[PDB]
């Protein structure tokens, strides 16, 4: 079997700068002339999207800022210039020969100005509480880097325990991630507290951003 | 010609035989959708690490679809890989000349 | 138009099989090869192998081999992989795709696999609503089994400003939010609402976020 090793794992570029994504073969995968190893992008969420095959040549309705090079074992991929919409994985695929084998994939970061979290906190809706249940959500939308922690406080007292996070693969448009923190309790201890605190701390500030509700 | 490579499959129509020049005779039938195209044709070493034999047959091209294509190569003498069309599928026929 | 319409979303006990299927239209479906491939959770591609329609020529993987059947029905345009003897390293999302050139250049959007023997349960819908400017809103999808859920904003209308999170494990249960960020004359004025659907329970849940 023909491995096909990507290289680097992932790589951050600032937008309208060059990317170039490597992808080495263990062996030849030229015959007739023609390499057969092929380019895909995939974004989250969504099928591989074939870039260029035979090594250099685009696809129909692939921008021209995708370039392709090589032959027998060495292998690159170049966008140039980066733009935002190219947040994506990237990955390469050999068939010269079968078993048809791929890369490991490229994730490409896109590197744009700091921006700090757009912080909202909501309390637990009646109809969760009806069932039992309480849920704290906090939306931490729109930074940049990714890098954020979050600390929950009840009345005061930081919480560590029932804290769930989730972080969003970076924006298709603006080049941001987002993330949002839940901290689920029991009804019990969620009706015997008041204040319910969500703070943010970001590179953007050296303040935690500080959001919060009193159950009043 | 110009044309770029088939993609699809070929189907054998006549087996491999040996002519009294000892060359080799092959006819391929395409089955795939590249309407006039340049079926790939390579003859190797049984660990396909290089190329031997030589085309008689001058660019070998798929005119209609469902209509045999006739190959002619010189082998080199022993054993070979005779090689068609694309992977998966790609046909890959064994021959041994004198 | 060539299309390629996948099968839905499926749960499978270890040891147990499923017969997965890829409906192929616009193009002659006898004339090009039919591949599958695998992507696990948070990994990469695998092909499995590969059906010509015209004869029912298969190239598989060898890995795939015990694992993975093959087939294709001409009078329908369908292709089927059916996954023998079910184990956890073949809960995945498998892609089938055509390979038009020489490379794959229409795919499915492919069909999650989950193999598990927990139980499907539908979720819980909660409304996340404030208790200035642009107003944050949202929607809570607690304590469902297996991924994944589907969730829109106003039937697709709001697309802008939505932010739908990555599902979190829990218990044997996934748990997942989704805000939405819209002008602050938009809300309450216009109505507000998220669609979640949960194909493996058939749920389909409307929650209209009302004001605290
Ligand atoms: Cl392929």
């Known amino acids: 079997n023909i491995v096909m090793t990507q290289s680097p794992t992932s790589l951050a570029v600032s937008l309208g700068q060059r990317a170039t994504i490597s992808c080495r073969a263990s062996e030849s995968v030229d015959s007739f002339g023609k390499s057969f190893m092929h380019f895909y992008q995939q974004k989250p969420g969504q099928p591989p999207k074939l870039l260029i095959h035979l090594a250099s040549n685009l696809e129909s309705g692939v921008p021209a800022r995708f370039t392709g090079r090589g032959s027998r074992t060495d292998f690159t991929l170049t966008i140039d210039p980066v733009e935002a919409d190219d947040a994506a994985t990237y990955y390469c695929q050999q068939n010269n020969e079968v078993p048809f084998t791929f890369g490991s994939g490229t994730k490409l970061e896109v590197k744009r100005a700091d921006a700090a979290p757009t912080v909202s906190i909501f309390p637990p809706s009646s109809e969760q509480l009806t069932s039992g249940g309480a849920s704290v959500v906090c939306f931490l939308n729109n930074f940049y880097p990714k890098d954020i922690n979050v600390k929950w406080k009840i009345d005061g007292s930081e919480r560590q325990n029932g804290v769930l996070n989730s972080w969003t693969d970076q924006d298709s448009k603006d080049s941001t991630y987002s993330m949002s923190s839940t901290l689920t309790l029991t009804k019990d201890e969620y009706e015997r507290h008041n204040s319910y605190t969500c703070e943010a701390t970001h590179k953007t500030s050296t303040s935690p951003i500080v959001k919060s509700f009193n159950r009043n | 010609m110009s044309y770029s490579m088939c993609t699809g499959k070929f189907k054998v129509v006549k087996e491999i035989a040996e002519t009294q020049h000892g060359t080799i005779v092959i006819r391929v039938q395409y089955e795939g959708d590249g309407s006039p195209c340049k079926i790939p044709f390579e003859i190797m070493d049984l660990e396909k690490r290089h190329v031997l034999g030589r085309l008689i047959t001058v660019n070998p091209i798929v005119t209609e679809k469902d209509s045999p294509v006739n190959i002619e190569a010189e082998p080199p003498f022993g054993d070979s890989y005779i090689i068609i069309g694309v992977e998966p599928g790609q046909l890959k026929l064994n021959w041994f000349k004198k | 138009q060539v299309q390629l319409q996948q099968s839905g979303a499926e749960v499978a006990r270890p040891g147990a099989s499923v017969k997965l299927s890829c409906k192929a239209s616009?193009?002659?479906?006898?004339?090009?090869?039919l591949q599958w491939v695998k992507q696990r959770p948070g990994q990469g591609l695998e092909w499995i192998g590969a059906?010509?329609?015209?004869?029912?020529?298969?190239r598989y993987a060898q890995k795939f081999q015990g694992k993975a059947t093959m087939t294709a029905d001409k009078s329908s345009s369908t292709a089927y992989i059916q996954l023998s003897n079910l184990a956890s390293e073949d809960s995945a999302v498998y892609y089938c795709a055509r390979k038009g050139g020489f490379a794959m250049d229409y795919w499915g959007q492919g069909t999650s696999v989950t193999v598990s023997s927990a139980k499907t349960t539908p979720p819980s819908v909660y409304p996340l609503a404030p208790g200035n400017s642009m107003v944050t809103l949202g929607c809570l999808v607690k304590g469902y089994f297996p991924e994944p859920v589907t969730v829109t904003w106003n039937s697709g209308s709001l697309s802008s400003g939505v932010h739908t999170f990555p599902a979190v494990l829990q218990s044997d249960l996934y748990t997942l939010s989704s805000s939405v960020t819209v002008p602050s004359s938009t809300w309450p004025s216009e109505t507000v609402t998220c669609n979640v659907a949960h194909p493996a329970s058939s749920t389909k849940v409307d929650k209209k976020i009302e004001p605290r």
């Open positions: 616009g193009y002659t479906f006898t004339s090009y090869w």
């Open positions: 059906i010509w329609p015209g004869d029912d020529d298969t």
